[PDB]
């Protein structure tokens, strides 16, 4: 399990995380992938967390896309990615509450 | 100047118990104290070990200093003995052990460690209340041969306080009569085996 990722997703760590989730309510919304279809999330806190995560992602995307080699295609691709992120964020701002 | 106040053990116990689940802004300084105490923890260990109750002793009471924070606890007394008496005691214990060995088909040797790595060592308050600690190692005596020594031989302070045979409770010097000495010598035949 060299290079840290393996360590992170080693069974023991996972178990610990699960335990934390069970007792006290420590989740790491960084750690899990954000769900595709909203309205399968009855809790508000979770939703908020997800929204926050997406915002963070968007910010990250923004930070990188103004790099100096602007003509490279990665940046262009991200522009679409950025849009997608924005859309997701908007969706997360649903009007149930 | 004026000596230390002999505190109650109860207070000490209470102090100890308080600093188990210690995680408030209350006792910030107690944690610091605890940290500091590592300095003297080996000393403490040495002390406690030194005071180990000998096999002729059910349970030794012992002098104790302790930081009011509850950070460290030193056994304070340094265990001195009447050398010949001590030797005699040891010999007796040895004899007893031998007898036990002779007796027993299998001798139930301890498992180590004695408590589990998960299980946190029981507080002393679970077994103060428990029944009289089972009998210790002291051999079967006789009135004819070992007439003099038997009464005190297996006592915590090998010779009693307030007697003319030792200095006193400080237990710093001893003077014996002949017959007791002789008895001791007889007892010590295993260990003192010298040319």
């Amino acid at each position: 399990m060299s290079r840290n990722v393996d360590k992170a997703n080693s069974v023991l760590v996972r178990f610990q995380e699960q335990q934390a989730e069970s007792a006290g309510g420590y989740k790491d919304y960084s750690r899990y992938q954000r769900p595709r279809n909203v309205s399968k999330v009855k809790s508000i806190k979770e939703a908020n967390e997800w929204k926050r995560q997406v915002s963070k992602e968007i910010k990250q995307k923004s930070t990188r896309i103004y790099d100096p080699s602007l003509n490279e295609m990665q940046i262009a691709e991200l522009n679409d990615e950025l849009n997608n992120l924005f859309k997701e964020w908007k969706r997360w701002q649903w009007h149930i509450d | 100047y004026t000596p230390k106040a002999e505190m109650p053990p109860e207070h000490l116990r209470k102090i100890i118990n308080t600093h188990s689940d210690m995680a408030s802004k209350m006792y910030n300084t107690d944690k610091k104290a605890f940290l500091g105490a590592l300095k003297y923890l080996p000393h403490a260990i040495l002390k406690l070990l030194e005071n180990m109750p000998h096999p002729w002793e059910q349970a030794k009471e012992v002098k104790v200093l302790y930081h009011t924070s509850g950070a460290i606890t030193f056994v304070n007394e340094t265990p001195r003995v009447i050398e010949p008496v001590y030797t005699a005691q040891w010999s007796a214990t040895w004899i007893a052990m031998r007898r036990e060995k002779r007796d027993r088909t299998h001798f139930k040797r301890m498992r180590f460690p004695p408590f589990d790595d998960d299980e946190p060592p029981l507080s002393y308050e679970q077994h103060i209340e428990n029944i009289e600690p089972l009998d210790p190692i002291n051999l079967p005596l006789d009135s004819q041969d070992d007439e003099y020594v038997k009464d005190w031989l297996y006592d915590s302070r090998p010779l009693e306080e307030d007697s003319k045979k030792v200095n006193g409770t400080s237990y710093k010097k001893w003077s014996f009569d002949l017959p007791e000495m002789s008895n001791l010598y007889r007892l010590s035949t295993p260990l003192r085996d010298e040319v």
Partner: protein, 107 residues
């Protein structure tokens, strides 16, 4: 050949303060206290160091919770002092543990 000068032993100095007070205690009790106090010390120090992922058994055998990333490992390599202390504590526990057992009807 020993110290000509030094009368002042460690305990005496401590006594001379107000922060220590003294009781008479059963030796097993004292041992137990030491075990507990010692354990606390080792945990407290460890937590201060930041490494919260090296968990102490109550038997004093220290070992890690997860498998530590390399940075964490670097942070949390305790040295020849701390380990020695731990070992000493363990030894104490073992003798103290045996006496506790004896006291209890177990042995």
């Amino acid at each position: 050949l020993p110290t000509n000068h030094n009368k002042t032993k460690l305990l005496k100095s401590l006594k001379n303060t107000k922060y220590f007070q003294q009781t008479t205690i059963d030796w097993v009790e004292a041992g137990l206290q030491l075990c507990r106090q010692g354990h606390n010390m080792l945990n407290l120090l460890i937590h201060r160091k930041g490494l919260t992922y090296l968990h102490l058994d109550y038997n004093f055998n220290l070992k890690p919770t997860k498998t530590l990333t390399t940075k964490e490992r670097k942070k949390s390599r305790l040295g020849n002092s701390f380990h020695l202390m731990r070992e000493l504590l363990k030894m104490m526990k073992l003798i103290v543990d045996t006496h506790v057992q004896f006291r209890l009807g177990n042995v």
